[PDB]
Amino acid sequence: RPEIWIAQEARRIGDEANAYYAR
């Protein structure tokens, strides 16, 4: 689970960052 938890976090931040700059 730790690797999945890290991945879940990185994805959330990455999609937030993508949205910020795309807007």
Add this chain to the structure above:
Amino acid sequence: DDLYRQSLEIISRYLREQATGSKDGAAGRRALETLRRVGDGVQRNHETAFQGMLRKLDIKNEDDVKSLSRVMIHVFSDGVTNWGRIVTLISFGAFVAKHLKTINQESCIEPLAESITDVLVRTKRDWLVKQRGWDGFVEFFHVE
């Protein structure tokens, strides 16, 4: 393999600047300036999460990169690829590099940079080519 070589240089250079606090064609330079601005901002705005991610990662040394590669593959396993995820992974790479340097001032950032570059270029080759590589990165993160 110009794309692999160009990507490793940009990513390595960023990680090394971040870890050491020193900064040393024009297209690569624009990419690195973009990455500094965006990557530094991700790290600043996601300090708490990056600290938690780092703790969970439990990286042992400069070579202990297999866990991070697994994380990066898992990130993209929902079939979505975008520049925000990509820059976030590189920014976290920078955050890890700074920590490695803390414990051992003689640690090298290359295994990390290489690990990250391998995932991106090998697994997203055609996506990057369609984006016109780092020109797409620069364009996407272009701010006025």
